[PDB]
Amino acid sequence: MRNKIFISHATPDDNDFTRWLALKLIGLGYEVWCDILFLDKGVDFWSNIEKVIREDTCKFLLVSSSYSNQREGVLKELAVAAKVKKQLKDDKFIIPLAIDEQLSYDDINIDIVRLNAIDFKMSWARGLKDILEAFEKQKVPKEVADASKSNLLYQQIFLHDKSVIEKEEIYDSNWLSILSFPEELRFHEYNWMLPKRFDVRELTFPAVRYKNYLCTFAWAYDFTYHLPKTETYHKSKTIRIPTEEILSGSYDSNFIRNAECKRLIVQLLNKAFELRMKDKEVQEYEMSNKTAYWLEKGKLEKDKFEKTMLVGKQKDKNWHFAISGASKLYPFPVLMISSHIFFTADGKKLIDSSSVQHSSRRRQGKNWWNNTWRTKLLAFIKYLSDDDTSFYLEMGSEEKVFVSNEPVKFKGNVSYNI
Amino acid sequence: MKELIYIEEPKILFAHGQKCTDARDGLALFGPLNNLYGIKSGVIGTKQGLKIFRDYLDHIQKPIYNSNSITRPMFPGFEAVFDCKWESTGITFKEVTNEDIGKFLYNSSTHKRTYDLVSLFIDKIISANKNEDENVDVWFVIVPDEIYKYCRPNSVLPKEMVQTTYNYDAQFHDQFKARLLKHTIPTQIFRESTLAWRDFKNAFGLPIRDFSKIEGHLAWTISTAAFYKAGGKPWKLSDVRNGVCYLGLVYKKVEKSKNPRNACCAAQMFLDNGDGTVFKGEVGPWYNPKNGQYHLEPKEAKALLSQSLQSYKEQIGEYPKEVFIHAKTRFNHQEWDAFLEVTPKETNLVGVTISKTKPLKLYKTEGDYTILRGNAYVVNERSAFLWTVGYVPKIQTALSMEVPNPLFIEINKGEADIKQVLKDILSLTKLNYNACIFADGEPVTLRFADKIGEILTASTDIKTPPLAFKYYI
Amino acid sequence: IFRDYLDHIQKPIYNSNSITRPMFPGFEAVFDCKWESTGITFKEVTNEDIG
DNA sequence: AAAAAAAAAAAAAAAA
RNA sequence: UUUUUUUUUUUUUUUUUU
Numbered sequence: 001m002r003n004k005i006f007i008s009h010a011t012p013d014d015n016d017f018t019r020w021l022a023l024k025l026i027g028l029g030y031e032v033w034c035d036i037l038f039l040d041k042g043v044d045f046w047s048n049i050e051k052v053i054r055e056d057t058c059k060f061l062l063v064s065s066s067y068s069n070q071r072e073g074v075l076k077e078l079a080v081a082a083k084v085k086k087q088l089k090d091d092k093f094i095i096p097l098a099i100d101e102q103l104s105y106d107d108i109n110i111d112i113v114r115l116n117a118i119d120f121k122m123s124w125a126r127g128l129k130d131i132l133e134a135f136e137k138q139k140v141p142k143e144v145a146d147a148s149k150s151n152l153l154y155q156q157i158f159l160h161d162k163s164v165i166e167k168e169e170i171y172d173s174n175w176l177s178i179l180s181f182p183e184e185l186r187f188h189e190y191n192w193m194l195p196k197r198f199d200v201r202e203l204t205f206p207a208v209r210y211k212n213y214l215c216t217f218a219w220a221y222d223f224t225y226h227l228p229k230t231e232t233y234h235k236s237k238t239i240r241i242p243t244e245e246i247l248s249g250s251y252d253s254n255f256i257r258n259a260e261c262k263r264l265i266v267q268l269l270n271k272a273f274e275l276r277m278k279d280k281e282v283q284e285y286e287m288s289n290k291t292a293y294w295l296e297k298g299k300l301e302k303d304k305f306e307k308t309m310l311v312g313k314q315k316d317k318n319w320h321f322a323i324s325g326a327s328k329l330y331p332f333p334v335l336m337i338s339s340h341i342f343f344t345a346d347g348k349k350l351i352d353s354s355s356v357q358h359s360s361r362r363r364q365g366k367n368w369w370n371n372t373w374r375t376k377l378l379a380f381i382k383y384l385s386d387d388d389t390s391f392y393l394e395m396g397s398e399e400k401v402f403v404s405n406e407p408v409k410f411k412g413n414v415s416y417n418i
Numbered sequence: 419m420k421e422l423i424y425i426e427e428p429k430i431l432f433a434h435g436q437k438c439t440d441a442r443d444g445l446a447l448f449g450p451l452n453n454l455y456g457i458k459s460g461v462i463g464t465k466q467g468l469k470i471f472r473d474y475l476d477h478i479q480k481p482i483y484n485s486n487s488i489t490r491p492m493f494p495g496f497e498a499v500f501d502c503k504w505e506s507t508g509i510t511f512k513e514v515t516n517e518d519i520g521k522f523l524y525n526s527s528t529h530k531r532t533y534d535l536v537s538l539f540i541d542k543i544i545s546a547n548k549n550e551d552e553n554v555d556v557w558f559v560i561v562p563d564e565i566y567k568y569c570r571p572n573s574v575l576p577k578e579m580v581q582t583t584y585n586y587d588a589q590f591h592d593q594f595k596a597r598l599l600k601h602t603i604p605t606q607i608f609r610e611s612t613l614a615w616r617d618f619k620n621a622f623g624l625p626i627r628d629f630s631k632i633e634g635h636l637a638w639t640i641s642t643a644a645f646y647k648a649g650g651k652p653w654k655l656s657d658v659r660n661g662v663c664y665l666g667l668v669y670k671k672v673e674k675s676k677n678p679r680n681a682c683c684a685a686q687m688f689l690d691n692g693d694g695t696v697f698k699g700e701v702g703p704w705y706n707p708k709n710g711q712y713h714l715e716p717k718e719a720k721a722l723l724s725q726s727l728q729s730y731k732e733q734i735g736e737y738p739k740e741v742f743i744h745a746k747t748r749f750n751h752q753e754w755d756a757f758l759e760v761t762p763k764e765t766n767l768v769g770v771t772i773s774k775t776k777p778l779k780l781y782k783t784e785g786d787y788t789i790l791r792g793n794a795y796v797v798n799e800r801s802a803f804l805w806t807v808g809y810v811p812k813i814q815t816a817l818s819m820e821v822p823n824p825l826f827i828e829i830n831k832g833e834a835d836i837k838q839v840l841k842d843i844l845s846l847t848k849l850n851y852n853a854c855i856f857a858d859g860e861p862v863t864l865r866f867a868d869k870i871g872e873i874l875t876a877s878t879d880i881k882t883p884p885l886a887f888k889y890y891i
Numbered sequence: 892i893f894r895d896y897l898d899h900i901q902k903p904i905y906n907s908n909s910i911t912r913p914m915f916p917g918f919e920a921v922f923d924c925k926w927e928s929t930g931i932t933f934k935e936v937t938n939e940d941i942g
Numbered sequence: 943a944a945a946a947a948a949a950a951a952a953a954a955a956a957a958a
Numbered sequence: 959u960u961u962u963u964u965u966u967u968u969u970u971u972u973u974u975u976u
């Protein structure tokens with residue numbers, strides 16, 4: 001029977017490509033004949049070529065290049081291939097291969113002008129793959145052989161089975177956009193009304209001391225309880241600035257600089273969000289720089305908001321999901337939310353062993369993919385939400401910022417599938 | 419609702435002048451660029467260590483099968499992938515007796531025991547290099563695991579097993595590869611656990627470092643590292659532009675001298691006459707005083723940039739037209755002023771900062787898989803988020819394991835095409851010679867620069883360090 | 892000239908009198924080792940510098 | 943003695 | 959240290975205010 005694939009080629013030059021292709025095909029379980037690797041030395045080479053082409057060559061492969069177009073031997077064996085093609089009644093017996101970028105399809109030989117040629121010029125992988133389709137679709141015999149190396153290499157050829165596809169996809173970030181701000185950020189001249197050796201962290205509403213002024217989004221007299229002296233403050237001393245101009249960046253002068261007046265907004269938002277966690281009665285764990293907030297066991301109805309479980313158990317260790325918020329304004333007015341996992345011994349007391357907490361977090365997170373982080377983060381956002389679409393962060397009796405409960409959505413022009 | 423643009427996956431060059439995006443698959447089928455006719459292997463160690471090395475080498479001569487081939491391709495064998503000969507015959511082996519390695523190890527002072535262990539191996543390596551006729555391409559150093567428990571900082575040697583230099587780093591790897599720079603010996607250290615782990619077992623009875631499914635990539639990265647250290651070129655980039663020199667700067671702390679002194683290190687990557695890619699180090703470490711500056715004084719900046727520029731002229735001849743300087747820390751004005759002075763008129767100096775600290779986490783709407791790597795959100799002409807870490811379809815998994823964090827790229831100085839800047843760092847994420855992975859999360863300039871920084875702060879007596887990466891990685 | 896000499900010694904070479912000085916049969920023939928003209932690492936030294 | 947916005951060195955685990 | 963990555967810890971620095 002015919003179970004050999006003959007690779008005609010220009011011997012002086014094209015030996016490298018032909019050797020590579022022959023090795024690949026032999027590895028792929030296909031029997032291969034070529035002068036460089038399978039010709040028997042000290043034998044009538046033309047007679048052997050005639051015998052193999054006429055008798056056992058099931059498929060013919062010609063390596064066509066700038067040399068092989070005018071080589072005599074390839075022309076003779078090509079004519080023999082054409083004759084045996086006429087004998088066999090197989091139009092797919094011969095597949096020429098284009099190797100040279102310089103060999104335009106205009107100047108290729110006529111009998112392979114009539115034939116369609118499988119392209120190898122750009123990549124030697126796509127061309128070999130196309131040989132693969134050509135051989136199974138025409139049912140070229142293939143010995144299974146090792147059946148492990150063969151099919152493993154067959155899969156390794158197609159690097160092609162999973163490529164980028166042009167498809168729209170939406171992405172939900174961990175960012176919450178700030179819908180609105182109070183009209184003006186106020187710079188009160190409290191001066192001696194505010195005690196010098198006092199801490200603004202325990203104050204009811206966020207406020208930062210800059211120079212000799214108190215900076216906040218609250219009304220002037222919202223801090224009467226902690227500052228009783230401020231009952232007689234004059235509101236004409238207020239240094240209101242058009243907050244929207246600061247967001248644009250228009251306002252800049254000796255009193256305040258664009259660089260620091262944006263650092264004075266993110267701190268106020270940070271303190272407001274901290275007070276927001278304190279209002280919601282969530283518990284706190286001290287991280288290296290920030291302080292994350294988690295939910296107790298039993299505080300939620302069966303410890304799961306919406307349809308995702310947020311507090312659970314592994315062995316003795318009770319795991320709690322937590323979120324930390326950070327306010328930045330460079331890309332947009334944004335509160336980014338980062339997710340964290342904490343562990344407790346009885347559901348209420350956080351484990352003091354940092355190594356135990358880190359190892360426990362690793363063991364839990366060993367098997368959480370995207371839909372285990374995203375849904376839980378959104379559920380926590382919904383729990384902190386005051387209405388269907390947003391919640392409010394409060395800095396004053398009447399001034400608040402609305403933070404949307406849905407993450408900033410992006411769009412991807414490329415996607416993929418499992 | 420914001421648009422993010424995708425940048426094409428880079429393809430890296432292989433034998434026969436053809437290109438491929440994947441590295442392991444590309445060298446698996448296409449072959450390396452240059453021929454290392456044979457690899458002359460030298461091994462130092464004890465008896466129970468050499469046997470495991472020989473067994474592993476015999477294992478990796480034959481193909482090794484992975485559990486899930488879509489995530490991790492088939493390994494055809496060292497001789498199959500690199501067409502080079504490297505067997506168990508011809509191994510120049512040096513003895514390290516168990517009693518001798520025990521005498522120094524059971525020492526109360528961690529620094530003293532570390533220095534003694536480093537000296538014991540290094541003196542033997544130097545002797546083998548100098549007083550023997552055999553030539554060794556690369557020197558594999560294998561060390562036991564009790565050494566691996568008790569030879570780095572914060573390692574408390576157990577009291578029941580204590581039996582009995584401060585100007586050196588107590589990390590064995592850094593000190594070892596640091597003191598060997600004067601002799602230019604390509605070296606690569608093994609843990610015995612990294613070797614045929616099946617002998618090492620835990621309490622539960624399974625091997626502590628069970629690599630049953632990941633033997634393949636173990637062989638992949640060890641073979642690639644050995645090929646690189648012996649002078650071979652595994653792959654090469656294809657989209658490198660002419661006249662572009664990059665440099666990657668990193669700063670490291672030194673504990674030996676009072677104040678960290680903040681040693682700086684750089685790594686170069688540029689094209690050469692023809693198609694040969696020159697990817698060497700830029701090692702003239704310029705120590706930067708003060709505890710937390712990370713901004714480098716003008717004279718050292720001038721020296722570093724010049725030493726980079728003649729490092730281009732001696733190989734290509736003419737002035738670069740565009741330089742794209744990368745670093746982990748931001749650039750302030752005074753160092754850029756010094757840089758500009760050395761920079762010639764036609765040369766376009768670009769100073770780009772790189773950071774992973776930005777908390778952006780894009781969660782796709784549905785699917786137990788992350789965003790696809792290569793996606794880029796452009797904040798503005800100067801700054802962007804580029805997901806160098808993420809999912810790539812070919813490897814069937816994400817390069818990340820949790821939700822990835824994109825890379826923050828800002829053109830701090832210069833003008834630069836931000837799209838082109840993003841089109842170059844993702845290419846630099848492919849040149850990881852130390853590991854046979856699809857891609858790396860950070861550019862190789864800032865990674866090999868980090869490595870050469872970590873290796874040079876171990877020994878303070880280094881003079882004119884080698885600029886070849888084979889002595890470092 | 893170095894490349895030419897390496898090419899010569901790649902092939903066998905013959906002395907005038909074989910019984911006195913045996914002919915050299917080829918580098919790979921004698922040492923069973925691969926050492927070709929391809930892959931030489933060259934380091935240029937211009938004539939002006941040595942002048 | 944704080945703050946935020948930037949810095950590195952180390953340890954633990956699980957993935958390729 | 960075959961690697962990679964995500965975290966967890968500290969520590970530090972700058973610019974400003976008292």
Ligand SMILES: Nc1ncnc2c1ncn2[C@@H]1O[C@H](COP(=O)(O)OP(=O)(O)OC[C@H]2O[C@H](O)[C@H](O)[C@@H]2O)[C@@H](O)[C@H]1O
Nearest residue numbers: 008009010011012035045049068070071072073074075077
């Ligand atoms: N005793 C010999 N006589 C002739 N040629 C020989 C001999 N021994 C080896 N060769 C080599 O045989 C080669 C003759 O090839 P060519 O006619 O020049 O150019 P092509 O591209 O048309 O050859 C392509 C086919 O002819 C081949 O035979 C194969 O069968 C090819 O399939 C020379 O390299 C000789 O070095």
